[PDB]
Amino acid sequence: QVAGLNVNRNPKFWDIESENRDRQEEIDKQREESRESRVIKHPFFHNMKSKE
Amino acid sequence: KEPIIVLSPAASSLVRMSNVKEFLQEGKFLDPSKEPASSSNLLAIQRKSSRFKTPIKLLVVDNVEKLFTKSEYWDRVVAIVTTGKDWQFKNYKYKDPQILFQKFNGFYFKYKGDAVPASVKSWNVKVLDIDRVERFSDRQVVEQFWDTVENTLVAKRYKS
Amino acid sequence: PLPVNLRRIIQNAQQIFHLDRAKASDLTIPEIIHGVRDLCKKLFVLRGENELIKEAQQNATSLFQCLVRARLATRRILEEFRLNRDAFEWVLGTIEAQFQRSLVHPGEMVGVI
Amino acid sequence: GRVLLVGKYRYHDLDELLVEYVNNVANKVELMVSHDKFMSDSLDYVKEWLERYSKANGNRSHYIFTFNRKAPGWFFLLFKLNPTSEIKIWNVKALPDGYLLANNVYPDTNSLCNGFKTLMSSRR
Amino acid sequence: MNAPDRFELFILPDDVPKLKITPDSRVPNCIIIKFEREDHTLANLLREELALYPDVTFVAYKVEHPLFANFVMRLQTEEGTRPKQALERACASIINKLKTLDHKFNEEWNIKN
Amino acid sequence: ELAILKEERTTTPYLTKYERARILGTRALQISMNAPVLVDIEGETDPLQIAMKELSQRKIPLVIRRYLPDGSYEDWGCDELIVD
């Protein structure tokens, strides 16, 4: 029970599609994550790509 | 029958097949990480000692899987170099490190100032320290190693 | 009182390299002369190339160089101590390293001491 | 990680993995190259040489090994029974314990050749 | 204020084992036994019983600190025998000796009373 | 101005005991405050022991600025100072 307000979401009186697009973009921004490189100490280890 | 010296095939070993000859024989220590890897697992070195009139020829073997098919080869082993790893001894004569180290001479090479591994302290092996900067003590460390090896050889009454 | 105990270094070299027995030495006389002479110019107390720095450096090590030359003499090395080549190089390197370790450290509060 | 897995193989450290896997695989590759029935050239040249040798010596079946440039760590076993038979290519994988052909592990190259000949005889 | 409870000298905690055996890998066929809540009374008895066995090559004990009630024993035997078996034989032998000693004492006391 | 060029550095090339103590303390504090470690730790947990391990392998990312009495200074990396 999140929608506790009786907002008049009539299709002729409410921009349903823009709300859906904005909410989808807000979920697509909540999917953002943080990442970083890995450091390993080994004599034969080198931080290189496959071709490198 | 020349005696056999067994080295650890681990990449973290300070003594490898690339620089074992120049270290044990010539008395100069070079970093094995910078030296290229050696394709041959068998090498021959010469030791000059005051206890013996003639130089002694010794064979250095990295892997015992292809060179110790006969049990009589283990009678020629006079020194074992280990890195403190249990998996070195899967195919050895004594799969338990303890019995192997009471029945054979164990040597561990570490840089001066580094901490000894826990397994090394729990085993009967000698600890030899190589300084990172000063290079004059390499001959002294090699002399300690060869003193232990020659004591074992005289105790075994080897003929040369 | 002087730094770097030379007697201890010599007997350590004798014990390490087994300098007993009447075996002849392979240590040539020019090697001894040049080794001692070069050792007496690597005992760095002060670093730099200025002439005053070199004069102060030569002044600071006069007594220790006298001690080293009195001990590491050619006849003494060949007859009393009976060093070989490896023992000689080990003694020279050990003398240099131990002299480097005996210098005072900057930041010492020598006044309070 | 304390446990490292390379397929079904299980190891406890990087050095153990290296010594037990990579060195053994390199030894098997060296043995395969040093074998008399090996050719390191291109696949088309290998097929042409096999065709020419089969045409010249059609009384016997000829088999050769070559590098799998498309799939690294593998080998192509090309054998031609006779000039009228199409060239059939088999996949051999370089494992630490030997060579894997037709889900069978052969310790050495000669054992691999003997197993290949036995399989051809049984399938005939 | 900092005085430990007197019953801690002989009462064994729930999480503390009475006996812990570890091998001594420096020499072959040697173990280190740690006895908890014991003192010289058992240690000296076991040590001097074990020292008379032909197959026991080394036996010793030490109480590290008198403020802690524990001792540590080192035991080394021949190749054929295991040290734990020697310890069990020693315990059984001392029990038998005490049994016959008690029997003879009771006999003599009954005779003299 | 006050900086001294790396070619004409005249101070001792050895790490003094005060510099060693200060570097170990600073590195231990940084490690205890979640700084990345530059050496492979096997089972070590104490920050001071990890700092000592880093020092023995010449992997401490710190610079020592030695001050002369006149005000000038020399910058020495922890990896180019000899440590016993």
Instruction: Specify the CATH number for the domain of residue E112.
Output: 3.30.1360.10
Please indicate whether, in this complex, the C-beta atoms of A39 and F39 are within 8 angstroms of each other: no
Q: Any bridge partners for residue F73, and if so which?
A: F3, F67
CA–CA dist E49, A40 (Å, integer): 57
Nearest to F17 among C47, C48, C105 (CB): C105
**CATH class for the domain made up of F1-84:** alpha beta
Return the number of other C-beta atoms located less than 10 Å from residue F57's C-beta: 17
Return the number of other C-beta atoms located less than 10 Å from residue D4's C-beta: 14
Closest CA relative to residue B77, chosen from B68, B88, B85, B86: B68
CA dihedral A6, A10, A14, A20 (to 10 degrees): 80
Closest CA relative to residue C71, chosen from C25, C39, C97: C39
Instruction: Tell me whether chains C and B touch (3+ CB pairs under 8 A).
Output: yes
CA–CA dist E46, E35 (Å, integer): 12
Left (φ > 0), alpha (ψ -120 to 50) or beta: where does E24 sit?
beta
Catalogue the E-assigned strands of A1-52: none
Amino acid identity for residue E70 in this structure: N
Q: The domain containing residue E87 runs over which residues?
A: 1-113
CA–CA dist F34, D47 (Å, integer): 61
Q: Can you give the length of chain A in residues?
A: 52
Contacts of D26 in chain B (CB under 8 A): none
Catalogue the E-assigned strands of B62-143: 77-81, 106-111, 126-130
Closest CA relative to residue F39, chosen from F64, F60, F63: F60
User: Does the beta carbon of A41 lie under 8 angstroms from any beta carbon of chain B?
Assistant: no
Contacts of B98 in chain E (CB under 8 A): 23, 25, 28
Instruction: Tell me whether chains F and C touch (3+ CB pairs under 8 A).
Output: yes
CA–CA dist C63, D99 (Å, integer): 74
CB B88 within 8 A of CB B11: no
Helix (H, G, I), strand (E, B), or coil: what is residue E98? helix
**From the centroid of its chain, how far is CA B9?**
11
User: Does the beta carbon of C17 lie under 8 angstroms from any beta carbon of chain B?
Assistant: yes
CA–CA dist D25, D75 (Å, integer): 13
CA–CA dist D28, D25 (Å, integer): 5
Number of domains in chain E: 1
Contacts of B33 in chain A (CB under 8 A): 43
Return the number of other C-beta atoms located less than 10 Å from residue C83's C-beta: 23
Min Cα distance E49 → chain B (Å) is: 28
Return the number of other C-beta atoms located less than 10 Å from residue B147's C-beta: 14
Min Cα distance A40 → chain F (Å) is: 8
Give me the phi and psi of B117, to 5 degrees please: -65, 155
Per-residue buried b or exposed e for A1-20, using 16+ beta carbons within 10 Å of the residue's own CB: eeeeeeeeeeeeeeeeeeee
CB B76 within 8 A of CB B1: yes
**From the centroid of its chain, how far is CA C88?**
10
Place of tokens 């900086």: F3
Please indicate whether, in this complex, the C-beta atoms of B85 and D23 are within 8 angstroms of each other: no
